[PDB]
C-alpha cells in the first residue's frame, strides 16, 4: 500500500471529473447489484431474486458493456424534480381551485358528464398499471442513471392517477347520476372500448425482462396514450366546453415529453451496440399491434 | 497437510482463523493458537494448555496429532488451561 | 374552492381489478409479490393509516430539501472537519458508508411493492416510499461529498457498497436479505415493520441529537428531515401483517417479523452499539446503547407486537441477554482489526471511561477490561506489534460478522454449527443457526470473507491480500485508532 492524497469527488468519478455535477455526485453508477453477475445480491448466487435478476437483468438480449453511463438528458435529481413539479402540480392546483370557483363543470356541454365517466374516470386504472410498470422497469434496470428516470416516472403517474381521482370526485358533485366514481372497475373490466386497453397493460406488466419492459412501456405504450386517448381527449373536451380538461392534459402531456426524451436518450445510449437495433426494432413489431388496437378501441368509444 | 481450524481461547472475546498442521500433536495446536491470544489480549499463565472440541466436557490427548484426533478441518476447538 | 382530500382520496387506491388477459397469479407471483396465497379481493382490506397526497408530497419535500440545503450552505464555514471530536468524525465515516448506497437499495424494497403488492393502498405508498429513499441516499451521498477533499476515508460513503470490506458485507448481507431480495409482503414486514419502524426511526433522532451536542448543525438538521420522512412509508409493514394474522398466516408473518428483528439487532450492535458507548466522547454520553434500547427500541418492539395479535420472538430472552454483552465484543473486534475498517475506531478506554462502562455494565472491568488491560500494557510499552492482528476472526455464516463471547473471567463463547447439504457452517447465535434454517436456498451456497480465504479467493492468503480484496486503495484509508492512542496518556 501506497500514501494517495483526497480526491476532490468519488473515486469513480475522479479521473474524468475536478467537479462534478450534483446530479453525477448523487446519481451515478449506484446499483452494487451489477458487480458480481452470478450474485447480483449479498445472498447465496441461487437465491430466488438472484436467480431472477441473473435471468430478466444480466441475460436480457438487450446488451451495453456500460449501461452505468447512460445519463438523463434533463439531469433530474430529487430535489430538481420537486422543484420542477411543485410548480406544475401548484398551477394545476390553482386551476381547479380556480375553475371550481368560476362553476365550470355546470357550464360543459348536455352530456358530457356521461363522456367523462365512460372514458376519463376510469384512466385512473390505466395510469395506476403506468405506477406500476414504472415501477416494475426501476427495479429491473441495469443503471441507478436508467433507474432514477423510472422512479421520477412512476411518481408522475401516480400524479396523474390522483388528478384523475380527485376530478373523478369533484365531477360527480355537479353530476351525481353519472355513475362518478362507483362505475370505472366495471368499465375498466367489461366495458369493450377499454378491453384493448386492459389487454394491452396485463400482457405489458408480464413481460419480466428489463429491456422488453422499457421498450413495451416507454417506446410503444406510452407515446399511444400520448397519440390516442391524451390528444383526442383534449379535442372532445374543445367540442363539448370543457376548458379544464384541455390545461390539465397539457400538465400531463409535459410529463409524458419528459418520459419521452429520457426514453430516447437510453435508446441513443443502446444503440452504441449495433446488435440493439434489430432487438429494440423486434420488441417494437411486438407491441405495436396490440397497442394500435388498444387505440383504435378507446377512440371510438371516446366518440360514440 | 495445512489444516485450518476455528479456536476459542480461554479467556478471549472471539474465535479465530488458526491454520495448523494435519501431523501437530495437541500441544503444539495450542501454541500456534496462544500465538495469536497471549499477550494481545489475555493474559500470560504458567501451566499446560490443553485443546477441546468446542463446549466439550473431554479434553484430547496433549500427544494426540490431529490426523489422529478425528476432527475435520474448519470445525471449532476451544484452548483453556488445567 | 379545493375539495378535502377525505373527500376523494379513496378513488386513489381503487386500483384492483380482476386480470382475465393474464391470470392472477401471472399479474402478482408468489415469489415476487409473497401474498401467501391470499386473493386480490383479500388484500382490498388493506388498511394503512397515514395519507399522502401527490400535490402536498411535492409541496412539503420542496420545503425540506431548501431548508437542509440552505443551512448545510449556511454553515460551510463551520470547519467541522477540523473541530469536530475525531469520534465524531469516525461517526460520520461509519455513518455515510453503511447508509447511504443502503437507503438508494432500499428504492428497489419499495419498488417491489409497488409493483408487487397486492393491495393497492401499498402500492401508492411505496410509490412515495421510492421517492423518500430516493431523498435519503441523494442527500447522504451530496452532503459527505464535501469531506472527499478532506480525508480518503469520505470516499466510503460512495465506496462502501461496491466493496468486500467485512463491515460492507455484513450490511449488504443483511439489506440484499430485508430490503432488495425478497417479495414484496415480505419487504413490508421485514424492512418497513422490522427495522425501519422498530430500528431506523428512533436511531435517527438518537443520531441528530448527538450530533448537535457535538456541534454538527448541518449534520443534525440533515439526519432531523431525512428522519421526518420515515413514518410516510414506514407504516406499510403493521397492515400487512394484521392482513396475514386475519387470513389464516399468523405463523408466517411471525416468522418473518422474528427473522428481521434478530438480523436488524446483530448489524445494529456492530455499526451503532460502538459508537454510543466507546466514540462519542464521556462527558457528551446522554446514555449507555443498553439505555438506549430499553428507552427507545424493546418496549415499542412489545407494544407493537401486542397490538398486533403477535407474540415477542421466541429468543426474547437471548436478545435482552445480548444488549449486556454483543456489541462490547463487537467493539473490542472493529479496534483490534481496525485497520480493515474504513473509519478510525475509538477504543474508549480510559480510567474515566471505564468507570461508565462499570456503571452502565456491571462486571465490566471483569469481563472486556481483561482484554483491554493487555492492550493498555502493550501500548505503554510500544509493543505496537501486538496490537495489530496476524491472523482473521472467524465469521458468522449469517451476520458476517466475527463469531464473539464474552472474554475475562466470565468467559462464554458459544458457535453454533451446523451441517447442511455437505458442508459445515458456523453462526454467533442460536437465532443466527435457526434464521439460515428458515430459509435454506437463501444462504446456502454464501461464501462469507473467510471461507472465500480458505477457498483460495483471496491472494495472497494473508493480511494484505484481505485489506487489498477489500478494496482499500492507499494507507490513509485503513482505519487506526481515532486519538492515535492519546488514551493511553490516562493510564
Ligand atoms: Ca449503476
Ligand atoms: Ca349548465
Ligand atoms: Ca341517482
Ligand atoms: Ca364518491
Ligand atoms: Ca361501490
Ligand atoms: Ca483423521
Ligand atoms: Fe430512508
Ligand atoms: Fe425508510
Known amino acids: 500500500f501506497e500514501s494517495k492524497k483526497p480526491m476532490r469527488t468519488w473515486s469513480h468519478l475522479a479521473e474524468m471529473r475536478k467537479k462534478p455535477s450534483e446530479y453525477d455526485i448523487v446519481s451515478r453508477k449506484l446499483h452494487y447489484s451489477t458487480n458480481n453477475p452470478d450474485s447480483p445480491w449479498e445472498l447465496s448466487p441461487d437465491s430466488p431474486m438472484n436467480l431472477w435478476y441473473k435471468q430478466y437483468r444480466n441475460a436480457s438480449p438487450l446488451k451495453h458493456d456500460n449501461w452505468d453511463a447512460f445519463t438523463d438528458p434533463d439531469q433530474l435529481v430529487y430535489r430538481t424534480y420537486n422543484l420542477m413539479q411543485d410548480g406544475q402540480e401548484s398551477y394545476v392546483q390553482s386551476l381547479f381551485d380556480q375553475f371550481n370557483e368560476r362553476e365550470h363543470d355546470q357550464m360543459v356541454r348536455e352530456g358530457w358528464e356521461h363522456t367523462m365517466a365512460r372514458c376519463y374516470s376510469p384512466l385512473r386504472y390505466l395510469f395506476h398499471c403506468l405506477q406500476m410498470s414504472s415501477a416494475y422497469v426501476q427495479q429491473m434496470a441495469p443503471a441507478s442513471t436508467i433507474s432514477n428516470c423510472c422512479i421520477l416516472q412512476t411518481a408522475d403517474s401516480l400524479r396523474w392517477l390522483t388528478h384523475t381521482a380527485y376530478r373523478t370526485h369533484e365531477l360527480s358533485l355537479t353530476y351525481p347520476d353519472a355513475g362518478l366514481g362507483e362505475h370505472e372497475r366495471e368499465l375498466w373490466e367489461k366495458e369493450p372500448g377499454w378491453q384493448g386497453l386492459r389487454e394491452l397493460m396485463e400482457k405489458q406488466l408480464t413481460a419480466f425482462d428489463w429491456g422488453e419492459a422499457f421498450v413495451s412501456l416507454n417506446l410503444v405504450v406510452k407515446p399511444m396514450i400520448v397519440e390516442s386517448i391524451f390528444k383526442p381527449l383534449q379535442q372532445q373536451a374543445w367540442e363539448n366546453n370543457d376548458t379544464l380538461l384541455p390545461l390539465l392534459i397539457d400538465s400531463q402531456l409535459k410529463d409524458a415529453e419528459r418520459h419521452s426524451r429520457w426514453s430516447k436518450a437510453l435508446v441513443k445510449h443502446a444503440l452504441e451496440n449495433p446488435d440493439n437495433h434489430a432487438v429494440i426494432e423486434g420488441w417494437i413489431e411486438k407491441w405495436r399491434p396490440l397497442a394500435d388496437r388498444a387505440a383504435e378501441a378507446y377512440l371510438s368509444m371516446l366518440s360514440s | ?82 | 374552492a379545493m375539495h378535502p382530500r377525505k373527500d376523494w382520496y379513496e378513488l386513489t387506491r381503487a386500483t384492483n381489478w380482476t386480470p382475465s388477459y393474464v391470470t392472477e397469479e401471472q399479474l402478482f407471483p408468489e415469489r415476487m409479490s409473497g401474498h401467501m396465497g391470499i386473493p386480490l379481493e383479500k388484500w382490498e382490506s388493506y388498511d394503512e393509516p397515514y395519507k399522502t397526497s401527490y400535490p402536498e408530497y411535492v409541496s412539503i419535500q420542496r420545503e425540506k430539501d431548501a431548508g437542509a440545503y440552505s443551512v448545510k450552505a449556511a454553515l460551510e464555514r463551520a470547519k467541522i472537519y477540523e473541530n469536530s471530536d475525531p469520534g465524531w468524525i469516525s461517526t460520520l465515516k461509519s455513518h455515510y458508508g453503511a447508509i447511504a448506497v443502503g437507503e438508494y437499495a432500499a428504492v428497489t424494497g419499495e419498488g417491489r411493492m409497488a409493483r408487487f403488492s397486492k393491495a393497492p393502498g401499498n402500492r401508492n405508498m411505496a410509490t412515495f416510499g421510492m421517492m423518500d429513499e430516493l431523498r435519503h441516499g441523494q442527500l447522504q451521498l451530496f452532503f459527505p461529498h464535501e469531506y472527499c477533499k478532506k480525508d480518503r476515508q469520505f470516499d466510503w460513503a460512495w465506496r462502501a457498497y461496491h466493496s468486500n470490506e467485512w463491515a460492507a458485507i455484513a450490511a449488504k448481507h443483511f439489506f440484499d436479505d430485508i430490503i432488495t431480495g425478497r417479495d414484496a409482503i415480505s419487504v413490508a414486514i421485514m424492512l418497513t415493520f422490522s427495522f425501519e419502524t422498530g430500528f431506523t426511526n428512533m436511531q435517527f433522532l438518537g443520531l441528530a441529537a448527538d450530533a448537535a451536542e457535538a456541534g454538527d448543525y448541518t449534520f443534525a438538521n440533515l439526519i432531523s428531515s431525512i428522519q421526518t420522512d420515515e413514518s410516510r412509508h414506514a407504516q406499510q409493514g403493521g397492515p400487512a401483517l394484521q392482513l396475514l394474522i386475519e387470513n389464516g398466516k399468523r405463523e408466517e408473518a411471525q416468522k418473518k417479523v422474528d427473522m428481521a428483528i434478530w438480523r436488524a439487532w446483530r448489524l445494529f450492535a456492530v455499526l451503532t452499539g460502538p459508537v454510543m458507548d466507546y466514540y462519542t466522547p464521556l462527558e457528551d454520553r446522554s446514555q449507555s446503547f443498553k439505555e438506549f434500547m430499553y428507552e427507545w427500541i424493546i418496549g415499542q418492539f412489545e407494544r407493537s407486537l401486542i397490538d398486533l395479535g403477535l407474540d415477542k420472538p421466541w429468543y426474547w430472552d437471548l436478545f435482552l441477554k445480548d444488549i449486556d454483552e454483543l456489541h462490547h465484543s463487537y467493539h473490542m473486534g472493529v479496534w483490534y482489526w481496525r485497520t480493515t475498517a474504513w473509519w478510525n475506531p475509538a477504543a474508549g478506554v480510559t480510567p474515566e471511561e471505564r468507570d461508565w462502562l462499570e456503571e452502565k455494565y456491571p462486571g465490566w472491568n471483569k469481563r472486556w477490561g481483561r482484554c483491554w488491560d493487555v492492550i493498555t500494557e502493550n501500548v505503554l510499552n510500544d509493543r505496537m506489534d501486538l496490537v495489530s492482528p496476524e491472523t482473521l476472526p472467524s465469521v458468522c455464516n449469517m451476520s458476517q460478522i466475527p463469531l464473539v463471547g464474552v472474554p475475562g473471567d466470565d468467559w462464554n463463547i458459544e458457535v453454533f454449527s451446523l451441517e447442511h447439504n455437505g458442508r459445515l457452517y458456523h453462526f454467533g447465535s442460536e437465532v443466527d443457526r435457526w434464521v439460515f434454517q428458515q430459509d435454506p436456498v437463501q444462504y446456502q451456497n454464501h461464501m462469507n470473507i473467510v471461507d472465500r480465504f480458505l477457498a483460495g479467493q483471496i491472494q495472497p492468503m494473508t493480511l494484505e491480500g484481505a485489506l487489498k480484496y477489500m478494496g482499500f486503495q492507499s494507507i490513509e484509508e485503513m482505519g487506526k485508532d481515532a486519538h492515535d492512542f492519546a488514551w493511553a496518556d490516562k493510564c
Open chain 2, 1 to 82: 497437510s495445512a489444516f485450518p481450524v476455528h479456536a476459542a481461547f480461554e479467556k478471549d472475546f472471539l474465535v479465530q482463523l488458526v491454520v495448523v498442521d494435519l501431523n501437530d500433536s495437541m500441544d503444539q495446536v495450542a501454541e500456534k493458537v496462544a500465538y495469536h491470544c497471549v499477550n494481545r489480549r489475555v493474559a500470560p499463565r504458567e501451566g499446560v494448555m490443553r485443546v477441546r472440541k468446542h463446549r466439550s466436557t473431554e479434553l484430547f490427548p496433549r500427544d494426540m496429532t490431529i490426523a489422529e484426533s478425528g476432527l475435520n478441518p474448519t470445525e471449532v476447538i476451544d484452548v483453556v488451561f488445567e
